[PDB]
RNA sequence: CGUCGUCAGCUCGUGCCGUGAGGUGUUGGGUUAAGUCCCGCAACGAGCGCAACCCCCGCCGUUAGUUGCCAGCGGUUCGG
């Protein structure tokens, strides 16, 4: 499912803004740029799909974040796509490990789309209308693909674990395991299933991302085609 | 009951940080009479206060017409 012309896509990249735990995953450095060693990628997106697989089969859930403006809407598309959880817009705090909690906000979020689903009263003050509507454009706007998360993933994926080191740790603390594609300006052993590749590239992401997406629906019961990428 | 003080404040739940007291939230940019609301944030909500809900005066309408009112008619001891 894997295809070798990523080269064509991604290679990683940055300068000395690096991090030496990364070392082992890195072939040269160019263009005053840190190169990764795709037969390194390789090895890995193997590991890591094999880790994915195993886990659609057995119906179970994956969290998406990534929210860098690159890997952000390309989240909102190929999360959707295997239906499952996603953040795309802010990360916020205690996502896992205060789930309970930040999901009772949720119920709020569903509540709101009832009492908007007509009518429970539009006798309600005119400017209650207009404050409640509000409220739930927010809890849209962040929430929008976390709902469907019932329970704790029984793993997690990230597109920055620098950039999303929050989650990570969420996750790390709950015995969550962690999938992440990550360039050189991160932290290696700090993922369990990992993906060497450039994470800035719209490319790359694309990339990486909808194979993964294509590899759950795949083996989750179905096949598909084509979905949306920006040119 | 006074008072600080009608001052915009004081907390809590769970999460997170710290060996710990404690921190965070409540800080931060804007805005407000105000922890008033906006945006942002390892926090997310919630409580008591703020506010609003009540009384008063200011405009109008309706329901009422005596012991209250008198615009027009009629008288009128000259006092609706
Ligand atoms: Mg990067
Ligand atoms: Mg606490
Ligand atoms: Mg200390
Ligand atoms: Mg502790
Ligand atoms: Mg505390
Ligand atoms: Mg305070
Ligand atoms: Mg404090
Ligand atoms: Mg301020
Ligand atoms: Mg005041
Ligand atoms: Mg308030
Ligand atoms: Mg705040
Ligand atoms: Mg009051």
Avoid: C
């Amino acid at each position: 499912v894997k295809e070798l012309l990523e080269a064509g896509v991604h290679f990683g990249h940055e300068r000395k803004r690096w991090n030496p735990k990364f070392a082992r995953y890195i072939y040269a450095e160019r263009n005053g740029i840190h190169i990764i060693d795709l037969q390194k990628t390789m090895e890995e997106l193997e590991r890591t799909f094999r880790f994915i697989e195993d886990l659609a089969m057995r119906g179970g859930t994956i969290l998406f974040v990534g929210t860098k403006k690159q890997a952000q809407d390309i989240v909102r598309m190929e999360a959707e796509r295997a239906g499952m959880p996603y953040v795309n817009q802010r990360w916020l705090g205690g996502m896992l490990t205060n789930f309970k909690t930040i999901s009772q906000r949720v119920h709020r979020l569903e509540e709101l789309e009832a009492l908007f689903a007509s009518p429970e009263i539009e006798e309600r003050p005119k400017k209650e209308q207009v404050r409640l509507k509000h409220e739930l454009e927010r809890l849209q706007k962040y929430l929008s693909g976390f709902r469907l998360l019932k329970r704790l993933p029984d793993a997690i994926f990230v597109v920055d674990p620098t950039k999303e080191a929050i989650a990570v740790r969420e996750a790390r603390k709950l015995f969550i395991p962690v999938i992440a594609l990550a360039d050189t300006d991160s932290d290696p052993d700090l993922v369990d299933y990992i993906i060497p590749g450039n994470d800035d590239a719209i490319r790359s992401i694309q990339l990486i991302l909808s194979r993964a997406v294509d590899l759950i629906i795949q083996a989750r019961g179905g096949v598909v085609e084509p979905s949306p990428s920006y040119a």
